[PDB]
Coordinates of C-alpha atoms in Angstrom, one line a residue:
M1 CA -8.9 24.9 11.0
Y2 CA -9.9 23.9 7.4
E3 CA -13.2 22.1 8.7
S4 CA -15.4 24.1 6.0
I5 CA -13.1 22.1 3.6
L6 CA -12.3 18.7 4.9
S7 CA -16.0 17.9 6.6
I8 CA -17.4 17.8 2.8
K9 CA -17.4 16.5 -0.1
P10 CA -15.0 15.4 -2.1
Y11 CA -13.3 14.6 1.3
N12 CA -15.8 14.2 4.1
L13 CA -13.1 13.5 6.9
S14 CA -14.2 12.2 9.9
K15 CA -13.0 14.6 13.5
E16 CA -10.3 12.3 14.2
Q17 CA -9.2 12.4 10.6
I18 CA -9.3 16.6 10.6
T19 CA -7.4 16.3 13.9
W20 CA -4.6 14.3 12.5
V21 CA -4.5 16.6 9.2
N22 CA -4.2 19.9 11.3
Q23 CA -1.5 18.4 13.6
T24 CA 0.8 17.1 11.1
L25 CA 0.6 20.5 9.5
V26 CA 1.9 22.0 12.5
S27 CA 3.9 19.9 12.8
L28 CA 5.7 20.4 9.8
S29 CA 8.6 23.2 8.9
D30 CA 8.4 25.3 6.1
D31 CA 10.9 23.3 3.6
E32 CA 8.4 20.0 4.4
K33 CA 5.6 21.8 3.7
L34 CA 6.7 23.4 0.5
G35 CA 8.1 19.8 -0.4
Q36 CA 4.4 18.3 0.1
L37 CA 3.5 20.4 -2.8
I38 CA 5.4 18.3 -5.2
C39 CA 5.4 15.3 -7.5
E40 CA 8.1 13.9 -8.3
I41 CA 8.1 11.3 -11.6
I42 CA 9.9 7.9 -10.9
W43 CA 11.2 6.8 -14.2
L51 CA 13.4 5.9 -6.5
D52 CA 15.6 8.2 -5.2
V53 CA 13.8 11.3 -5.4
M54 CA 14.7 12.4 -1.8
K55 CA 17.7 14.2 -1.8
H56 CA 16.7 17.2 -2.2
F57 CA 13.1 17.7 -0.4
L58 CA 10.3 15.5 0.8
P59 CA 7.9 15.2 -2.0
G60 CA 4.2 15.0 -1.4
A61 CA 3.7 12.6 -4.2
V62 CA 5.3 10.7 -6.9
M63 CA 4.2 9.3 -10.3
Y64 CA 5.0 5.8 -11.7
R65 CA 6.3 5.7 -15.4
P66 CA 5.4 2.3 -17.1
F67 CA 7.6 -0.4 -15.4
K68 CA 6.8 -3.9 -14.5
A69 CA 3.9 -4.5 -12.2
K70 CA 6.1 -6.3 -9.5
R71 CA 8.6 -3.4 -9.4
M72 CA 5.9 -1.2 -8.8
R73 CA 4.8 -3.0 -6.1
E74 CA 8.8 -3.0 -4.8
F75 CA 9.0 0.8 -5.1
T76 CA 5.7 1.2 -3.1
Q77 CA 6.8 -0.6 -0.1
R78 CA 10.1 0.9 -0.4
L79 CA 8.8 4.6 -1.0
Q80 CA 6.1 4.5 1.8
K81 CA 8.1 2.8 4.8
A82 CA 10.8 5.6 3.7
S83 CA 8.1 8.5 3.8
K84 CA 7.2 10.1 7.5
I85 CA 4.3 11.5 5.6
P86 CA 2.5 8.9 3.5
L87 CA 3.0 9.5 -0.2
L88 CA 0.4 10.0 -3.2
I89 CA 1.4 7.6 -5.5
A90 CA 0.3 8.3 -9.2
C91 CA 0.0 6.6 -12.7
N92 CA -2.1 7.7 -16.0
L93 CA -4.1 4.2 -15.9
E94 CA -5.6 5.3 -19.1
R95 CA -7.2 2.4 -21.0
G96 CA -6.8 -0.3 -18.4
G97 CA -3.6 -1.7 -16.5
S98 CA -1.6 -0.8 -19.9
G99 CA -1.6 0.9 -22.8
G100 CA -1.3 4.9 -23.8
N101 CA 2.2 5.4 -22.8
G102 CA 1.2 5.0 -18.9
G103 CA -0.3 2.8 -16.6
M104 CA 2.0 -0.4 -16.1
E105 CA 3.9 -2.6 -19.0
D106 CA 2.3 -5.8 -17.9
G107 CA -1.1 -4.7 -17.2
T108 CA -4.2 -5.6 -19.3
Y109 CA -4.7 -3.0 -22.0
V110 CA -9.0 -2.8 -22.4
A111 CA -9.5 0.1 -24.9
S112 CA -9.0 3.4 -25.5
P113 CA -11.3 5.8 -24.0
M114 CA -13.1 6.7 -27.2
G115 CA -13.6 3.0 -28.2
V116 CA -15.3 2.7 -25.1
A117 CA -17.4 5.7 -26.0
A118 CA -17.5 3.9 -29.2
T119 CA -20.0 1.1 -27.1
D120 CA -22.0 4.0 -26.1
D121 CA -22.3 1.8 -23.1
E122 CA -21.5 3.6 -20.1
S123 CA -21.2 0.4 -18.1
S124 CA -17.6 0.0 -20.6
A125 CA -16.6 2.8 -18.7
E126 CA -17.2 2.0 -15.6
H127 CA -15.6 -1.4 -16.4
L128 CA -12.3 0.6 -17.5
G129 CA -12.2 2.4 -14.5
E130 CA -12.4 -0.7 -12.8
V131 CA -9.5 -2.6 -14.2
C132 CA -7.3 0.6 -14.0
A133 CA -7.9 0.9 -10.4
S134 CA -8.1 -2.9 -9.3
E135 CA -4.7 -3.5 -11.5
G136 CA -3.0 0.0 -10.4
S137 CA -3.8 -0.2 -6.6
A138 CA -2.9 -3.9 -6.4
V139 CA 0.6 -2.8 -6.6
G140 CA 0.0 0.2 -4.0
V141 CA -1.0 3.1 -6.9
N142 CA -3.9 5.1 -5.6
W143 CA -4.3 8.0 -7.7
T144 CA -5.3 8.0 -11.4
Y145 CA -4.5 11.1 -13.7
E146 CA -8.1 10.2 -15.4
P147 CA -10.8 10.7 -16.6
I148 CA -10.2 12.8 -19.4
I149 CA -13.0 15.0 -20.0
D150 CA -11.7 17.4 -23.2
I151 CA -13.8 17.3 -26.0
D152 CA -12.8 16.3 -29.1
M153 CA -14.0 19.0 -30.7
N154 CA -11.1 19.8 -33.2
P155 CA -9.9 16.5 -35.4
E156 CA -7.0 18.1 -36.1
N157 CA -5.6 18.5 -32.7
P158 CA -3.0 15.6 -32.0
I159 CA -3.1 15.0 -28.1
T160 CA -6.7 14.5 -27.3
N161 CA -8.3 12.2 -30.3
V162 CA -8.7 8.4 -28.8
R163 CA -8.0 9.9 -25.0
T164 CA -11.4 11.6 -25.0
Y165 CA -14.7 10.1 -24.8
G166 CA -15.5 11.9 -28.0
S167 CA -17.0 15.2 -29.2
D168 CA -20.6 15.2 -27.3
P169 CA -20.7 17.0 -23.8
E170 CA -23.8 14.4 -22.4
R171 CA -21.8 11.4 -23.4
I172 CA -18.2 12.7 -22.0
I173 CA -20.6 13.3 -18.5
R174 CA -22.1 9.7 -18.5
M175 CA -18.4 7.7 -19.4
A176 CA -16.6 10.3 -17.5
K177 CA -18.8 9.8 -13.9
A178 CA -19.0 5.3 -14.8
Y179 CA -15.0 5.7 -15.2
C180 CA -14.9 7.3 -11.5
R181 CA -17.5 5.1 -10.6
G182 CA -15.2 2.0 -11.4
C183 CA -12.1 3.4 -9.8
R184 CA -13.6 4.2 -6.5
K185 CA -14.8 0.9 -6.3
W186 CA -10.9 0.1 -5.6
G187 CA -9.9 3.3 -3.6
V188 CA -8.0 4.5 -6.5
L189 CA -8.3 8.8 -6.5
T190 CA -9.5 10.2 -10.0
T191 CA -8.3 13.4 -11.6
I192 CA -10.6 15.3 -14.2
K193 CA -8.4 16.8 -17.2
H194 CA -7.3 19.1 -18.7
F195 CA -8.8 22.3 -17.2
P196 CA -9.5 24.3 -18.9
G197 CA -10.5 22.2 -21.2
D198 CA -8.4 20.7 -24.5
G199 CA -9.9 19.9 -28.2
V200 CA -10.9 23.4 -29.1
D201 CA -7.2 24.2 -30.4
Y202 CA -5.2 21.9 -32.8
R203 CA -2.1 22.4 -31.2
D204 CA -0.2 20.4 -28.4
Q205 CA 0.1 21.7 -24.8
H206 CA 3.6 19.9 -24.3
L207 CA 4.9 22.0 -27.2
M208 CA 3.2 25.6 -26.4
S209 CA 0.3 27.2 -24.6
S210 CA -2.7 26.4 -26.4
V211 CA -6.0 28.3 -26.3
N212 CA -8.9 27.4 -26.1
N213 CA -10.9 30.4 -27.5
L214 CA -14.1 29.6 -27.0
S215 CA -16.4 32.9 -26.0
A216 CA -17.1 32.7 -22.2
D217 CA -20.5 31.5 -22.9
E218 CA -20.1 28.8 -25.3
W219 CA -17.1 27.5 -22.9
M220 CA -19.7 27.9 -20.1
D221 CA -22.3 25.8 -22.0
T222 CA -19.8 22.8 -23.0
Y223 CA -16.9 22.6 -20.8
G224 CA -17.9 24.5 -18.0
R225 CA -21.2 22.2 -18.1
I226 CA -19.0 19.0 -17.9
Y227 CA -16.9 20.5 -15.4
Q228 CA -20.0 21.5 -12.8
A229 CA -21.0 17.8 -13.6
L230 CA -17.9 16.0 -12.6
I231 CA -17.9 18.2 -10.2
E232 CA -21.1 17.6 -8.1
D233 CA -20.3 14.0 -8.8
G234 CA -17.4 14.1 -6.5
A235 CA -14.6 14.5 -8.5
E236 CA -11.5 14.0 -6.0
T237 CA -8.5 16.0 -7.8
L238 CA -8.5 18.4 -11.1
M239 CA -5.4 19.1 -13.3
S240 CA -5.0 22.6 -14.3
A241 CA -3.0 22.4 -17.7
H242 CA -1.2 25.3 -19.5
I243 CA -4.1 25.7 -21.8
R244 CA -5.5 29.5 -21.8
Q245 CA -9.1 30.5 -22.0
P246 CA -9.0 34.0 -22.7
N247 CA -12.6 35.1 -23.0
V248 CA -13.5 33.4 -19.9
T249 CA -10.2 34.8 -18.2
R250 CA -11.4 38.7 -19.4
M251 CA -15.0 37.8 -17.9
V252 CA -13.5 37.6 -14.3
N253 CA -11.4 40.4 -14.7
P254 CA -13.0 42.7 -17.9
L255 CA -9.6 45.1 -17.3
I256 CA -6.7 42.0 -17.7
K257 CA -4.4 42.7 -20.7
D258 CA -3.6 39.8 -23.0
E259 CA -0.1 39.5 -21.8
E260 CA -1.3 39.1 -18.4
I261 CA -3.7 36.2 -19.4
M262 CA -1.8 33.0 -17.8
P263 CA -2.7 29.2 -18.9
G264 CA -4.8 27.5 -15.9
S265 CA -2.0 26.3 -14.3
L266 CA -1.0 29.7 -13.2
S267 CA -4.4 31.8 -13.5
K268 CA -6.2 32.8 -10.5
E269 CA -9.0 34.0 -12.5
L270 CA -9.1 30.5 -14.1
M271 CA -8.6 28.2 -10.9
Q272 CA -9.6 30.8 -8.1
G273 CA -12.1 32.8 -10.0
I274 CA -14.1 29.9 -11.5
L275 CA -13.5 26.4 -10.0
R276 CA -13.0 27.6 -6.3
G277 CA -15.5 30.3 -6.5
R278 CA -18.1 30.1 -9.2
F279 CA -17.9 26.0 -9.2
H280 CA -17.2 25.9 -5.7
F281 CA -14.9 22.9 -6.5
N282 CA -13.6 21.7 -3.4
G283 CA -11.0 18.7 -4.4
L284 CA -7.1 19.0 -5.1
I285 CA -5.9 20.4 -7.8
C286 CA -2.3 20.1 -9.5
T287 CA -0.9 21.1 -12.5
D288 CA 0.3 19.4 -15.5
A289 CA 3.5 18.4 -15.9
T290 CA 5.7 21.2 -15.3
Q291 CA 8.4 20.6 -18.1
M292 CA 5.4 21.0 -20.7
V293 CA 6.8 24.2 -22.8
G294 CA 3.0 25.4 -22.4
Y295 CA 4.2 25.9 -18.8
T296 CA 7.8 27.1 -19.5
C297 CA 6.9 29.7 -22.0
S298 CA 4.5 31.4 -20.0
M299 CA 6.7 33.2 -17.5
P300 CA 10.2 32.7 -16.0
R301 CA 10.2 29.4 -14.1
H302 CA 11.7 31.3 -10.8
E303 CA 8.4 33.2 -10.5
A304 CA 6.1 30.6 -12.2
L305 CA 6.2 27.3 -9.6
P306 CA 5.5 29.6 -6.6
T307 CA 2.8 31.8 -8.7
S308 CA 0.8 28.5 -9.5
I309 CA 0.3 27.8 -5.7
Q310 CA -0.8 31.0 -4.8
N311 CA -2.9 31.4 -7.9
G312 CA -4.8 27.9 -6.6
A313 CA -2.9 25.1 -7.0
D314 CA -2.4 23.0 -4.6
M315 CA 0.2 20.8 -6.4
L316 CA 3.2 21.2 -9.1
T317 CA 3.7 17.7 -11.3
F318 CA 7.0 17.1 -12.0
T319 CA 10.5 19.1 -11.4
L320 CA 13.0 20.2 -14.2
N321 CA 16.4 20.7 -12.2
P322 CA 14.6 19.4 -8.5
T323 CA 17.4 21.4 -6.7
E324 CA 17.0 25.1 -8.5
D325 CA 12.9 24.2 -8.5
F326 CA 13.0 24.1 -4.6
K327 CA 15.2 27.1 -4.0
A328 CA 12.7 28.9 -6.3
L329 CA 9.8 27.4 -3.8
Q330 CA 11.6 28.6 -0.6
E331 CA 12.5 31.8 -2.1
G332 CA 9.3 32.8 -3.1
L333 CA 7.9 32.0 0.2
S334 CA 10.3 34.3 1.6
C335 CA 9.7 37.3 -0.5
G336 CA 5.7 37.0 -0.9
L337 CA 5.3 35.5 -4.1
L338 CA 3.9 32.8 -2.2
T339 CA 2.0 33.5 1.3
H340 CA 2.3 31.2 4.1
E341 CA -1.6 31.2 4.4
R342 CA -2.0 29.6 1.1
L343 CA 1.3 27.4 1.5
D344 CA -0.9 25.5 5.1
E345 CA -4.1 25.6 2.7
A346 CA -2.6 23.7 0.1
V347 CA -0.5 21.2 2.2
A348 CA -4.2 20.8 4.7
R349 CA -5.4 19.8 0.9
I350 CA -2.6 17.7 0.4
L351 CA -2.9 16.0 3.5
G352 CA -6.5 15.6 3.4
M353 CA -6.4 13.5 0.6
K354 CA -4.0 11.2 2.1
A355 CA -6.4 10.8 5.3
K356 CA -9.1 10.3 3.1
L357 CA -7.6 7.3 1.5
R358 CA -6.3 6.0 4.8
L359 CA -3.0 6.0 4.7
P360 CA -2.0 7.3 7.9
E361 CA -4.1 4.7 10.2
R362 CA -2.7 1.5 7.2
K363 CA -0.4 -0.6 8.7
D364 CA 0.9 -2.6 5.9
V365 CA 1.0 -0.3 3.1
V366 CA 0.5 -2.8 -0.4
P367 CA -2.3 -5.4 -0.4
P368 CA -1.6 -8.9 0.2
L369 CA 0.2 -10.2 -3.1
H370 CA -2.7 -12.3 -3.7
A371 CA -4.0 -8.7 -5.1
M372 CA -1.4 -9.3 -8.2
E373 CA -3.5 -12.0 -9.6
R374 CA -6.0 -9.4 -10.6
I375 CA -3.4 -8.1 -13.2
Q376 CA -4.3 -9.5 -17.1
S377 CA -7.3 -11.9 -14.9
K378 CA -10.0 -13.5 -17.4
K379 CA -12.4 -11.0 -16.4
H380 CA -10.3 -8.3 -17.3
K381 CA -9.2 -9.5 -20.5
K382 CA -12.8 -10.6 -21.6
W383 CA -14.0 -6.8 -21.1
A384 CA -12.0 -5.8 -23.2
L385 CA -13.2 -8.3 -25.9
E386 CA -16.6 -7.3 -25.3
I387 CA -15.5 -3.7 -25.4
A388 CA -13.5 -4.9 -29.3
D389 CA -16.7 -6.5 -30.2
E390 CA -19.1 -3.4 -29.6
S391 CA -17.1 -0.7 -30.7
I392 CA -15.7 -1.6 -34.1
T393 CA -17.8 0.8 -35.9
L394 CA -18.6 0.4 -39.7
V395 CA -18.1 4.3 -40.7
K396 CA -18.4 4.1 -44.8
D397 CA -19.5 1.2 -46.8
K398 CA -20.2 2.5 -50.4
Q399 CA -18.3 -0.3 -52.1
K400 CA -21.6 -2.8 -52.8
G401 CA -20.8 -6.9 -51.9
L402 CA -17.0 -6.5 -50.5
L403 CA -18.4 -7.2 -47.2
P404 CA -18.2 -9.8 -45.9
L405 CA -14.9 -10.9 -47.0
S406 CA -14.3 -14.6 -48.2
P407 CA -11.1 -15.7 -50.0
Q408 CA -13.9 -17.2 -53.1
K409 CA -14.3 -13.4 -53.6
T410 CA -10.8 -11.8 -52.5
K411 CA -8.5 -14.5 -52.6
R412 CA -4.7 -12.7 -52.6
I413 CA -4.8 -9.4 -50.6
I414 CA -1.9 -6.3 -50.1
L415 CA -2.0 -5.5 -46.5
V416 CA -0.3 -2.1 -46.3
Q417 CA 0.5 -1.0 -42.9
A418 CA 0.4 3.0 -41.9
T419 CA 1.9 3.8 -38.4
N420 CA 4.0 6.8 -36.6
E421 CA 5.6 4.1 -34.2
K422 CA 8.4 2.3 -34.7
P423 CA 8.7 -1.1 -34.1
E424 CA 11.7 -3.2 -34.1
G425 CA 11.8 -5.4 -37.2
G426 CA 9.2 -2.7 -39.4
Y427 CA 5.8 -4.1 -38.4
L428 CA 3.2 -3.7 -35.2
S429 CA 2.9 -7.2 -33.7
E430 CA -0.9 -5.9 -34.1
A431 CA -0.6 -6.1 -37.4
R432 CA 1.5 -9.2 -37.8
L433 CA -1.3 -11.1 -35.6
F434 CA -4.1 -9.6 -38.2
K435 CA -2.1 -10.8 -41.2
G436 CA -1.8 -14.8 -39.7
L437 CA -5.4 -14.4 -38.5
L438 CA -6.4 -13.3 -42.4
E439 CA -4.2 -16.2 -43.8
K440 CA -5.9 -18.7 -41.1
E441 CA -9.7 -17.6 -42.8
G442 CA -7.6 -19.0 -46.7
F443 CA -6.1 -16.0 -47.7
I444 CA -3.1 -14.8 -49.5
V445 CA -2.1 -12.5 -47.6
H446 CA 1.7 -10.0 -48.7
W447 CA 3.2 -6.7 -47.3
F448 CA 3.2 -3.9 -49.4
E449 CA 7.0 -4.1 -49.2
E450 CA 7.0 -7.9 -50.6
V451 CA 5.1 -7.4 -54.0
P452 CA 5.5 -5.1 -57.0
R453 CA 3.7 -1.8 -57.9
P454 CA 2.7 0.0 -61.4
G455 CA 5.5 2.0 -62.8
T456 CA 7.8 1.4 -65.9
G457 CA 8.1 -2.4 -65.5
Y458 CA 4.6 -3.4 -63.8
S459 CA 0.9 -2.2 -65.2
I460 CA -2.1 -1.7 -63.1
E461 CA -3.6 -4.8 -65.2
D462 CA -0.5 -7.0 -64.0
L463 CA -1.5 -5.2 -60.4
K464 CA -5.3 -6.6 -61.4
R465 CA -4.0 -9.9 -61.9
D466 CA -2.0 -10.1 -58.6
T467 CA -4.1 -8.8 -56.0
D468 CA -8.0 -9.1 -55.5
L469 CA -7.8 -6.5 -52.6
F470 CA -6.0 -3.6 -50.7
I471 CA -6.1 -3.6 -46.8
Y472 CA -4.5 -1.1 -44.4
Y473 CA -3.9 -1.3 -41.4
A474 CA -3.8 2.4 -39.9
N475 CA -2.3 3.0 -35.9
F476 CA -1.2 6.9 -36.0
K477 CA -1.5 6.8 -32.1
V478 CA -0.9 9.9 -29.8
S479 CA 2.0 10.8 -27.9
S480 CA 3.7 13.7 -26.5
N481 CA 5.2 16.5 -28.5
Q482 CA 4.0 15.5 -31.9
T483 CA 2.3 18.5 -33.8
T484 CA 0.3 16.0 -36.2
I485 CA -0.9 12.6 -36.0
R486 CA -2.1 12.6 -39.4
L487 CA -1.7 9.9 -42.1
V488 CA 1.8 10.1 -43.4
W489 CA 3.0 7.7 -46.0
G494 CA 3.4 8.2 -51.1
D495 CA 2.8 5.7 -53.4
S496 CA 1.6 3.0 -50.7
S497 CA -1.5 5.0 -50.5
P498 CA -5.0 4.1 -51.6
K499 CA -4.3 5.7 -55.2
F500 CA -6.2 2.5 -57.3
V501 CA -9.7 2.3 -55.5
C502 CA -11.2 2.3 -59.1
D503 CA -9.2 -0.5 -60.2
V504 CA -8.3 -2.8 -57.0
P505 CA -11.3 -2.9 -54.4
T506 CA -9.7 -1.2 -51.4
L507 CA -10.6 -1.7 -47.4
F508 CA -9.2 1.0 -44.9
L509 CA -8.8 0.0 -41.0
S510 CA -7.8 2.7 -38.2
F511 CA -6.8 1.0 -35.1
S512 CA -6.7 4.3 -33.4
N513 CA -7.0 8.1 -35.0
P514 CA -10.7 7.9 -36.4
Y515 CA -10.5 11.1 -38.6
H516 CA -8.1 9.3 -41.3
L517 CA -11.0 9.9 -43.8
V518 CA -9.3 13.7 -43.8
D519 CA -6.6 11.8 -46.0
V520 CA -7.8 8.7 -47.6
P521 CA -11.1 10.7 -48.6
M522 CA -11.3 8.3 -51.8
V523 CA -11.8 5.2 -49.8
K524 CA -14.9 3.1 -50.1
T525 CA -14.8 1.2 -47.4
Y526 CA -13.8 2.6 -44.0
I527 CA -13.7 0.8 -40.2
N528 CA -12.8 2.7 -36.9
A529 CA -11.3 0.6 -34.4
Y530 CA -9.9 3.1 -32.2
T531 CA -7.4 0.6 -30.4
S532 CA -4.8 -1.3 -31.8
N533 CA -4.5 -4.5 -29.3
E534 CA -4.6 -8.3 -29.4
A535 CA -8.6 -8.2 -28.8
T536 CA -9.5 -5.5 -31.5
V537 CA -7.9 -7.1 -33.9
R538 CA -9.3 -10.3 -33.4
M539 CA -12.7 -9.0 -33.0
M540 CA -12.2 -7.2 -36.7
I541 CA -11.8 -10.9 -38.3
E542 CA -14.5 -11.6 -36.4
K543 CA -16.9 -8.9 -37.9
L544 CA -15.0 -9.0 -41.7
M545 CA -15.4 -12.4 -42.3
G546 CA -19.4 -11.6 -41.4
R547 CA -19.0 -13.8 -38.2
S548 CA -20.1 -10.9 -35.8
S549 CA -22.1 -7.8 -36.3
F550 CA -21.1 -3.9 -36.6
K551 CA -21.8 -2.6 -33.6
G552 CA -19.9 0.2 -32.5
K553 CA -21.2 3.9 -33.1
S554 CA -19.2 6.8 -34.0
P555 CA -18.8 9.2 -31.2
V556 CA -17.8 12.0 -33.3
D557 CA -18.0 13.0 -36.8
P558 CA -15.1 10.7 -38.6
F559 CA -15.7 13.1 -41.5
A560 CA -14.7 15.9 -40.3
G561 CA -16.8 17.8 -42.2
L562 CA -15.4 17.0 -45.5
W563 CA -17.8 16.7 -48.5
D564 CA -15.1 14.2 -50.3
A565 CA -15.0 12.0 -47.4
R566 CA -18.5 10.8 -48.5

């Protein structure tokens, strides 16, 4: 059975492999099959309530991951899919591992407009992940960064141009497959139209059916045909596409991707002929929990096309809900077997059953933070940093002979110990190496009743802003927050603004005359920024997006 699925892309299993999937399927109890639908988060005692089909590692040390893998796999009757959000390399972006290589955000790669940079990104992700036993990355994101106010897309995307997104996403996958790591296209039906986070609600892709088909649909078809192994159906609604499949559907029946049969079975399975593994986005996100009673939602997600539920809330209650859903018919035994078949087929595709070692040789660990990976990080930084606005004649290149005294102003939504980002301290120290006098904004006076603008101009030749407003779950804005530290004197003291993450900061500092986007806040990007501000390195980056956000005043 299931040869029509397992023998073709993205599976392409052999006769023997399909026999293993079928024989394993037959040997599983109902509870075992239900457990296979669940991916459990590791933050490894996750088998007390059921036997899960997969796990995802939060960011611990690479060595710990390699240890967890050996233990988890050696204890699992059915080999586990081992997931990780390897987004920006081995490290970076709230996922990956703690001591991996942080290469660059996806948008920083897109700024290079060189798809070989995305392939390199995918290689570092999959090379360092597979060394510790990871075989499934929840990447690449193929959302379109349409709405500059969306807090959860932003630098996690390859920008706002569908054609570039397709180029970069395909290259990323190309790099991952070279290391035997499954890829995941997300977030279906597509984030980036709304301005709201699906962690906090069910966000809405409200494009017309045609508009969606022409943009998001085009990208998904491109990655599906490219051989995308897995897809993540997120808690985002597409009402107009849903109504196209089901014109009589009531607005209250329209479910997000993770619960919608019109989207997962009508569009993906049907119209687009996606044959890979579908998993939901994390089930504890508000976008999921607020759309339907949970005891109903978990089995309905599988019944409506999803093969896997990502994470549990209360594991006992959740498994009990799957048991009852199967018992009372919310989930059919026939759809259950078909889901497990696709889960087991990806485990067979990875050749996990035949393997008799589990983790690679310890020598594999040497790829982590290898010279080659560090070197790609420096190439991407050299190619990505983008001079967006340069309307102050003579300012660049910087030199202590033109602006000796600098006030360095940090702006971030992080809360680093000591008050300052290590990357900002490094930037400060490197400016001083060049011969600048650099004080933090907090160290020097500011205009007021006892300090004049003439005094400020006497003590300050240049303001420089280090902006790092990063993407994180459950944030409703990544806008620039302070307000006397803002560029309020751009016509009195020259002012330079540097964004090391969010590229739309001109929304909040439109008065700035010199503005540069770097997309990534890591040591490699900081070092190339210094080289470029001093005139030793040319500005090569190209905005993969509109950094002015359609604002007349930002120019």
